[PDB]
Every structure is written in structure tokens, then in C-alpha cells.
Nucleic acid binder design. Sequence first.
DNA 1: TAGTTATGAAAA
DNA 2: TGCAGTTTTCATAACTA
DNA 3: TAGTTATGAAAAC
DNA 4: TGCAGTTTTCATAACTA
DNA 5: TAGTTATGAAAA
DNA 6: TGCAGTTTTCATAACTA
DNA 7: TAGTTATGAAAAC
DNA 8: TGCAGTTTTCATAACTA
Lengths: 353, 356, 353, 356
Amino acid sequence: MKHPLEELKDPTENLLLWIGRFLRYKCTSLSNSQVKDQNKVFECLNELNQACSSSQLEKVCKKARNAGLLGINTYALPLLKFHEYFSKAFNSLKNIDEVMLAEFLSVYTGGLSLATKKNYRIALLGLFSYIDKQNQDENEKSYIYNITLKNISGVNQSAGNKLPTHLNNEELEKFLESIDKIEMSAKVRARNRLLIKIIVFTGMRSNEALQLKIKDFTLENGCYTILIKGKGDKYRAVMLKAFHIESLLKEWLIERELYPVKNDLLFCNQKGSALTQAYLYKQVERIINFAGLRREKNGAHMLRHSFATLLYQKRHDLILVQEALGHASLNTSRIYTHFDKQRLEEAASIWEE
Amino acid sequence: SMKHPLEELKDPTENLLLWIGRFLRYKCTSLSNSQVKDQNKVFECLNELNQACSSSQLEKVCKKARNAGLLGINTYALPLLKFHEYFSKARLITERLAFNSLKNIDEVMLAEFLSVYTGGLSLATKKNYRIALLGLFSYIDKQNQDENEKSYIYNITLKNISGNKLPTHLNNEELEKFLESIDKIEMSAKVRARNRLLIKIIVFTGMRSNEALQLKIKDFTLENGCYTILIKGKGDKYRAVMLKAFHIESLLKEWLIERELYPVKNDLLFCNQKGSALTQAYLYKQVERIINFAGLRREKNGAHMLRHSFATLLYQKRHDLILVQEALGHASLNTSRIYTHFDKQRLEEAASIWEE
Amino acid sequence: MKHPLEELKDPTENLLLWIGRFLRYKCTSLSNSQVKDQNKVFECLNELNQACSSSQLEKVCKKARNAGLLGINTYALPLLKFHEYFSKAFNSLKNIDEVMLAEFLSVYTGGLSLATKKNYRIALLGLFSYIDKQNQDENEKSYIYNITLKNISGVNQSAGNKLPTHLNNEELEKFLESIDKIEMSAKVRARNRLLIKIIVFTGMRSNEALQLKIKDFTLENGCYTILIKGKGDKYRAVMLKAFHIESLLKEWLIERELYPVKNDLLFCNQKGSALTQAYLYKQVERIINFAGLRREKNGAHMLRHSFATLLYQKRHDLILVQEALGHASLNTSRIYTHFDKQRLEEAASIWEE
Amino acid sequence: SMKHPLEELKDPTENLLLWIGRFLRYKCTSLSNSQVKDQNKVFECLNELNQACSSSQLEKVCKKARNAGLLGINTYALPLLKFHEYFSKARLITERLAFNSLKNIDEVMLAEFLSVYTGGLSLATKKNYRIALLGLFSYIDKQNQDENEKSYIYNITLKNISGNKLPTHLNNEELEKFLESIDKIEMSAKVRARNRLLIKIIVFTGMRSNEALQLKIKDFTLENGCYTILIKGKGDKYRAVMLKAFHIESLLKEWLIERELYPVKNDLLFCNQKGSALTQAYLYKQVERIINFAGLRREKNGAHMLRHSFATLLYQKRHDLILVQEALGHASLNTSRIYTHFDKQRLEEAASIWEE
DNA sequence: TAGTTATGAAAA
DNA sequence: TGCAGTTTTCATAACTA
DNA sequence: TAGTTATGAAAAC
DNA sequence: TGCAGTTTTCATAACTA
DNA sequence: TAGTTATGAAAA
DNA sequence: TGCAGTTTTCATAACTA
DNA sequence: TAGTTATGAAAAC
DNA sequence: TGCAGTTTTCATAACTA
Ligand SMILES: [Cl-]
Ligand SMILES: [Cl-]
């Protein structure tokens, strides 16, 4: 049902009221695939109704995110920062226009990345669009903000579109060698090296590699076909030559038998559960450091960008890049064409004539 | 004039029916009329939509409009009339809540209707119903206005519509077999030359069905063994496609001789015995007949499936999606990707980049 | 100064009132370079003020167009057709929305080309945008139509963007031969053949060729540089090998001495004035007919499209096409890339493998 | 809050001054702050624009903002303050007509101001003044609102702004001479290695001035004799450019050794003796010094002129405007065309298409 | 035969 | 990641000079 | 003959 | 980066000392 | 020297 | 044909540890 | 040791 | 054809039988 735009005497509390509604609305629409316990999310749902303060909204949203409802983080923090802006420094909610929002973005996201700025703007757009569709007074009249925020700097594409940090061909080989060269304890060496090499050789995402199942591995003519579970019982596939991981895979599978592994996980901690992104990052980063390859990004996804880049350099096949990386949009795949050596060569070689 | 108060009738059902008619009429003036032969048929539909005060009238007139060439009206008419049926039935059967006034029509109500009337339908069809509903209430929001110049705001924004299937294209080998089957399958002497030329042109160019059926001889330009064909495409988008002459030279000359005995109209390349353009129904049955004969039946079995096959082969040989985009007449890579199918086995081309 | 939106009791006359203002406004802003007598235009200016009927507006606009104010034709006829639509079949000007305009476009432009439809729409957009900026009542309040007409079919680019009718390489040669092969009287043969060949060899526009001056011809190393006067004392240049027109040029220049030529015109009628587009068209068309090359377009501009096309086929230089044809926008030059044989070949030749 | 009635002050001059301040303040929050070192300087400007009630204050604060990194504010400030001067002077000197109330500010008035204050200015500058004025009254139209929620509408839409000059680029031969002059001209041992490397990189890549001055060593990647350079460009647009190593290898190694003696900050490739990035002023004077020495002075004599020279040469060798578009970091062919200059003599390449 | 309308559905 | 929304074909049923 | 003016329509900038 | 907006030709009628 | 701010103007 | 409008460089003047 | 959870921030879809 | 909008990782803190 719709509520009047101004139900409370205090516009600050009234703003908090609409934010709580919007956040609860998003909690029901956003993906809950990473949610381990749906009961916790169900608790968060009604808690967003009984929440009457900024601290409570933040507390619940953190609880929901930590439960597996990850998407809520992109909306919660920015909007609650706006409530702080609106509360500190204005009699009505109608005073809120794009000019006020511009001032808010400047003050709160001024020292933040352009990508973060966009997240704040998108969060604002969603909130006031939600308000525009859910408000209606006793006189059956609705107030329409119609906020679009088009005049804000660095909000469109190509603005702050930082080309993905990655390794080239030579740097990748040095990283591969560094995996086997860096020291690791006997308890984790086989598992960790296998995990990171699979990521390097496939461009697999972090959570994709961490949730890999053994039954999804198929070996045919020296080639592994690895199935990766996606959204809604959907599977995507990647391929990997056996000789890259063959001896290392067998070594880990033997050790794995001494682990209390659950749910047919290929990789797991000592408790048998899937490894975290935190552990995977630190294991990847220390190798990056050891290889003297430290840069703007030093995680597993940086390796993912490296594979995509290498693949285009070697094949110049846009769709092959899409299908291998698992891109839903060719816009994403087209990003890696910006590193096309053969294309860059055409321009740089004009001086040789 | 074109603006009316939201509720003019005591009957919300009749009033909802009223707005639907107004919206569909607006669409008959705003949607493409390129396929319309006689514009007078459109004007008749425009007037008949005004005098319409029932569901049967609206359906008959919109069908009349579609059959006259205004093809786009078919996507809006039926879904809205099904909602009017839903609203009308609910108001009579369930005397409660929203169905007492169209002011109480909201997102929850539209969601239930889509859940009831689009049960065993594809996601694409469900998407069509949704877009239709959104358009109707967008029109009402813009066009409703009382005596005091005050309007009611719906602001309805429905959320997006969230096993493996058979192939929707012929691969390289299957394409070769289809081409052979075109010649191998039996056709009467009266139609064999014309029909073979028609289908083959479609195969080698990726031409849409209507684009092929409306080919004029003046659309062809021969130079150094190459036919440059000008195509008035979907949405009246023009593009040029090339067809090597050796693919159709003997077949074209054979049909053109037969064509002299036809009372051809509008300089059409292909025509029936009456001289008029062939229909999609005939083309489909002719194509499916060959597909079935070659044992190549799959998810789609029409000329459009051959269009998929063309784009897939084109990218397979050139690895250039822009080139596909040019040949098919698209504006973006995403749309061309729909026709460009990727064989999963080609993933080993990605796995082998490390060995080089 | 601004006027109230509704100054008259009759909305029909009030609409006619705004149209007359808009047309007069355009007559002052539109280019008057083709105007032979500025006095006639000055007369049309005040006549648009004293005009109190549709017939008078049409009469004046025709007068203005025939005087050299060509651009007025694109606005006059469509808007007066709208007044007819509004008068026939509504108490106020406020009733006019994009829904009414959609009905008007369907009824009046239904049997017309998509390009003509766009001209009607553009004319409407200008009128109601002009009204939005020039209306204000006694209460200092303005009514804003804000008409954009985005939901109308075939209004954007790529919609009805008919690829320019033209001749290919072989057809061009046959046309060139046909110029010398077709029969012409001794009084006009040298002049006409020279005129048409210059157009063919340069892709020059009709009015460009008709207004050519002798002083703008420069011969250097067997190559003619021809200057073409553009807008505001601006000149563009084309080049032409002498051997194409050398003997034919000298022949006409001798005959030209028996003409009372004015203003250093290269081509002229018997009265010494510049030839018309009408005469040039008929002379070009009859050759097209004679060559068996008749098609969708059979004028001098069709030859212009042919040159642009041939130039790209031979050079594949987009900027060269722009500079040779005199395009202000590369959007125009890029049109001829759609006929790129080498590009089309890449797709058609997939069956040969 | 951000909305105020159109006329709050009895003095229309003070009131016009008031709206200008509000508009410029909004621009300080909406324009790019990527060049701003200390964001606190921006916040100071924001507060000082509120307490400002005069022209001198607005100018000082906007200058302070520009000098702090908010470069875009310079295009709006001066033209509007010149209009405020025009309005203020006219109201005092000519006690008549529009200058009694800012409600009477219209198109005719703005046209006269542009005619008076932009006499001896370029068309581009005139265009800047126009855009500034349009932005101001667009802001006022959106932000004015009385106690009765009623607003005044300006709806001001100014019409567009309607001998031969010296070259604005170096051709192929001149480029070669410039490169020679870089080495031939005399520089002190302290700056010769650094300055030569800087300018040469600009020449061979078409890099913008600030893009070059802000180069980090981590931006360079060497592979098979090729340097791939990542550039954070204008409008924070990222692009990669390639530079063959043999052009700068000996010069780069020479400077890097000197660089070890510098207190370099932020891993900058080029820096002054303080370790901070070099200024556009220094770069310009260094470039113009070489140009003048080579006798190549023309319409433009800065590093941007070299950027023109790069694009012109690039298209001359490749005939690919998209390639130019990629190297320069543009979104359209029209913008790249600005840098791509066409030699009129090449028209004979068009005249010779008939002879083939 | 040799094709045509008409149409709810499914894309493009 | 996937729409905005207009404009086509699918895939038959029913029919005939 | 050898051209013109006038014009709705259709582009071409 | 497409658009709104401006400028020109199409293509034929109806002439004419 | 070896560079820096500051700035009205002119583009991009 | 050429903008919408934000974000840069031009091209000096004036100055100095 | 060998990993975890929590988190503002920054992307990556 | 860019977007609004959704989903995921970065990268570090603070732990701990
Ligand atoms: Cl993606
Ligand atoms: Cl152009």
C-alpha cells in the first residue's frame, strides 16, 4: 500500500521512515543466493519495520549482509549518510531537489573514488524513485521528485572507467613460477597452489573457484571441462588442459580424504567448509609481492582480468572472451580490446615510416 | 480534446474499457504504418475505435488494423483486453477491494493478473504483456485530467520478468545439407525454379522473410560477379547485402524466363500466379518442408532460423561481430549476439592460449 | 515581447496567430543567401503581421520562397495543414498534446514518405517550442507544452534512412559515354555537356555548378582547381584533371563570347543569367533515360551520390570523401561506407570456404 | 532549502547577484573535482559563496576554487559577473525599462550584453559566455519558488553564435625538424635529460599536457620493445597508448638515473627539484622555446599543437579516424576530426579516381 | 494444386 | 546485468479459385 | 526552341 | 552521438517571345 | 636558474 | 548542419628560493 | 598455524 | 547504447582454539 509523503511532524524521522521502507523493499528483491540461513533474513525483514533510528537500520543491514544478503551494502550506508546530512543541516521533504543532492555528493563522496560516487548516486536514484511510486496522501495526490541527477560529474560511463589492472604475458608466467617457488606449509601447499593455478588458467571468479564441486569436473582427451554453478540452477563451463594441474590435482585429492569435506567441495578448510575470499586474497597477494608484481590491484580478480586480456591478445575473438569469462554483456568483454597490442601497434608504428 | 477525467463512468469496468480503447487508438496513430497497403483502412479503424464501447468491438477493430498492415497493434490489444476481462470478472465475482474503482489498480493487482493469465506462456510473451500494461497506465497518467485540471497518478513500474532446448540454428555441415536438400527435394515444375531461388537467397544473405518476399529486380545490381542487393529492412532500416552470382546465376535466369508468363506487379522478383507477393505462410511451409525432408527439424524451423545460421557461420569465419551487425542490420553487438551461436567445444581454443 | 497564450476568443484564430509569429520569426533567422531582392522579403515580413487568415500566410510564404527565402517552405505548408486539422476538428490551445499531434501526423502524412513525416514533426516541434518561449499572460504565468514527440514511428535516424540512389563504376562510364552520344542542338551541346561532365567528375551540387565563376578556375600541371563559393564569403575547392574537359571547355568559352553573360558566370542562358535547376534536371534525366539507367532518382544530385560512392570505393578515405564532397559532418560522409564492396565481400565470401 | 522566491530583495541588482552566487556554488558541487588536491579548499569555497553578497567576493572565491583544482568554475564565473556589471551599470546609468526588475530580463537583453562585452573576442569565447548565461537562468527557472509554490519562467534560449589563419599543426617534415631541434637546442645539464624525454613522449603519443606531467613509472609496461602506457585522461577517461622503446630507451635510462637524486613524490616520472609535478607553464615555455628555435612558430605553439600534429600524421599514415579516436581518447569521429588536418593538395587523389 | 487470410504466441 | 519499447516472424488452422 | 517560374514533396545537409 | 534544426534538390506542371 | 602561481582567453 | 555543456590548454604576466 | 568474520570502499557485472 | 540497477570483490582489521 501507499503512504502519504509526509506522515510525521519531523521530516528527519519521515526521511528515516522512507529509507527503512526502501531498504526493506530491496531486501526482498535483491538476490539471496549467498544467504546461508533464510531465517536471519526473515528476522531482518520485520526488524526494518520496527526500526525507528539510523543506528537500528545500519545494525540490521549489517546483520543481513553478514547473513548472505550482500547487495544491501550498496544501498544502506550511502542512504544513511544522506539522512545524517539531512538531519544535521529544511522544514519539509519537498525541499529535497537535485541541487541539494549535488551538495551532499560533493561533501560526502569528495574524497572517494568515482566508482563509489556512482554507487551513492544510484542509491539516491532508487530511494527517491521508490518514494515517487509509493507516496499518496489522503487527498489521493502524490508528490513526484523525478530525480535523475544528470548534471553530476563522473556519473556516466567512460567517466572514471578505470581500465582493469592486470598482468601481461610475461608477468603471468612469472606469477605462475612464483606459485611453485614461494614457500608454503605442507598442510596447505598442494591445495592452495591448485586453487590459484585453476584461477589463473581459467580466469574464474573468486567465489566461483571456492565453490567448485568435484562432480563438475570432466576429463576428456587430456582436457578438463569444469562446470560452474551460476544463478538459478544454471551452469557455465570452462576448459583447462590436464597437464597444467594433473599431478597437483591428484596430490590434493589424496590429502583431501583426511578432511571432513562437505557438499562435494573440491577445496575446503580443516573444518570441511568452503574457503573464504579473505584467505584466498592473502594467499594470492603474498605471491604477487614475492614475484615483485604488486600494483593497483593484487587479488584473484586481477588474475581474472589478466586471463581475459591474454585471451583476446591471443585469439582476437570477442565472443570467445565472453563465453570463457562468463560475461552476460559484450560491453564487459569489449573492455579488454583496449589492450589490443596489434591495435596499439598500428598507431605507434607510424614513426617507423 | 484528447484529455478526459480519470473516472467519467459509474461503471469502473466500462471506464477501464474506455481508456484501453483510447490507448489502442493512440497506438494506431503512433505505431508504424509502413506495411499498410490502404491508409483508408487505418482511418476506418481510427473512427471505429471511437464508437467502440465494448471488448468485442476493440478486438475486431484491432484485428482489422493488424490484417490491414498495422502489425504492431497485435502486441498491445490482446494483453489489455485480457486484463479488462480480469478486472470485469473480479468485480462481478469478487465484490471486494480494488475492483470497485480503477483508482485502486496498483502493482499488486497487475502482478496477480500476469500470474493468472500468463501461466503456460514463454518469458518473452510474459514480457510483452508487462510492456503492454505499463504503456496503458503510462497513457492514462499522461491523459487523465478533471475539470479542475487535476490528475491522478498511477506511476506503475512493474518489476522485471525473471531444461536445455534443441538447437535454434544449422551449423556449417547442416547448412550444406540443407542447400543440397533444396535441390534434392521434389517440387512441381510450376514452382520449383521460383521457390528454390527464393530460399537460397535467404540462406546466402541472412535476409529476413518479408525482406525476401518484397524483393524487386531493381534492388539487384550486378558487377564483377557480385550482386549488391538493397534491402528495405525491419523498421524501414536500409542496408546493402552482397550475394556472389555463381550461387544463383543459372537459377535466376531460369526463373526470370518463367516470370515473363506471370502478371507481375510492382517489379517483384518473386510472386504468385496472381502476380502479387508471396506470403510468410507459404515461405514457412516451403522452408519447413525442406528442413523436415533433410531431417533437420529443431526448436525453430522457419526462414528466420536460417538467418540465425547465416550470422553464426559469418562470425565463425570472420570473428567480427560488427560485420554480422552490418549484414543483419543491427545497431548494437548485443542484438547481433542473439543470432550468433557459440559451440561449447570452442572453449578449448581458450584453454590452449597457454601452450603458444 | 511575449504575448499571452490565449489572447483571442477563437482558439483557431489564436493558433493562426502563433503560426504567423513563428513563420515571421523563421523568416528573420533562416538563410537569405538565395534572395535576389531583399525588398520583397522585407515586404513579406510585415505582411506576416497583418495576415489574419491561412490563405494569406500561405500566399506570403510562397512569395517569400519564390523570392529566394527557400527554407520557409519546410515550415509553412506543414503548420498550415495543422491549422486546417485543428479548425475542422477543442475549446482551448491547451488541449493540444502529443496525442493530438500523433493523430494529425497519421492523417496528414500517412501517405507521404518518412522523410516528409520528419519535416512535419520538426515543424511542429519548432512551433510549440517557440510558443513555450514567447507566451506569458497578465499574471506573469506561462503555459509550457514541452512537446518532444518521441513516441512517433520513423522519426529518429536509421528510420527511413534510404541509402542514396546512385550509379556504380560501370553505370557511370555508360552515363559519361551517353553524354557525348545523345543528340543535342548545336546551340546548347557544348555548354550542357561541359556542365554535366563537371558535375559527374567532381560530385558538385546543382546550384554549386550553376553558379560557377571563371575566375575561380585555376589550371596547374594539367589539373584544374575549382573554387566554389559557400556561405558567408567562404570558398571550398575541388580538383579535376584537365583532359576530361579541356577541349570541351575551350569550345564553350568561344561560344560564350556571343552571350550577354553577367557576373563572370561560366554557364548561362541566352539572357546571360544563370541556368535553373529545372533545366539542369531535365538535361540530366533525358541522358539517364537514353542510357537506360533510370531509377529511383534521376537528377544531378544522384550523380553527386555516385561520385561520393566511387571515391570511397577507390580510396577508402573518409576524410577525403568529406573534403571532396564538401560535407560539414562526417555523419554524411560515413553514409557511403554502406556500399563498400571490399566490406560486403568479406561477408558474401564465407560460402567459398 | 535550496529553493527561494525569485525576488527576495528590493534591489534587483543585489538579487541578481544573489542568484549568480547560488548558481556558481551549485557548479562547485557538480563540476569535476578530480584536479582538487585538498577537498577542504572546496568546502571553504562552498561556505564563502554563501556568505558572499558582492561581486568582489564571488570573483575571489571562484578564483580560489580554480586555483585549488576546481578548474571548471572559470568558464561560468567571469561571464556572469560581467553580466551583473552590465545589469548594475545599466540600472544606475539608464533609469528605464528592464533594469528595474530581473523579471524583465529576456533574450533581447542577453543579446545586447553579448554584443557589448564580447566585441574583440573569438567565436569560441562568445560561445562560452552564451552557455554560461543559459546555465544561470536555467538554474533560476528550476530553483525559484515563492510562498505559494509558484515559480517564474524565463525559458531563455539564445540563438547560436554564427581571413585565413596560420597552420595549427606540424606536417610530416616539420615534425621531423622539431624532433631534431629537441636534441639540437641547448639545455642545462640539470634539465636536459628530463625535458627532452618529456616533450618527446608527448610528440610520439599525442598525449595531453597534464596527462604527460602526471605520468607515473607504474604507468609504463615494457614488452618486446613496446611501452604500453596507461593514461588517466581528460574527464577521467582511461586509455592505453603505445610507444616504441627505441625512441626513448637511452633517454629514459639517463633521466631515471638523475631522478634518483630527486625527492620524487607519488612515483612521478617527471618532477621539479622539489619532487613535485611540473606545471603547464613550464612545459609550454619549454615547447615554445624549441618551436621558436626551429622557426616553426604558427597559430598555436604549445604541446597541444603537437597533439594535433600526432593525429594528423596518424590519419595520414593509416586513413583510420577510429584509430585516431582511440589514440586521442574521443567518443566521436567529429571530435577527432578537429585534430586531423587535411592538406588541400590531396584533392588530386580524388581527381585521379577516374584514371584507374 | 498453389497458395491465401487470420491469429495467439514468441521473439527481435 | 538487462532493460527501454517498437516491429517483426513463428507456426500453425482453415480455406479455395 | 531554349529555357523559365512555381510547387508539394523528399531529401540533404 | 543522435538528434533538432536548416538548407537544397526532386520532379513535374504550365508555360512562352 | 629553474621553475612557480595566477589568469582572461580559447578551445576541446 | 551544428549543437548539448563539462573540462581542458593557450599564453602569457609577475615572481623567486 | 590456518584460517575466520566484519567492513567501508571499489568495483564488476 | 548508455544507462539504472544488481551482484561481487578489494583489502584490511581483529581476531583465535
Ligand atoms: Cl558482463
Ligand atoms: Cl554534411
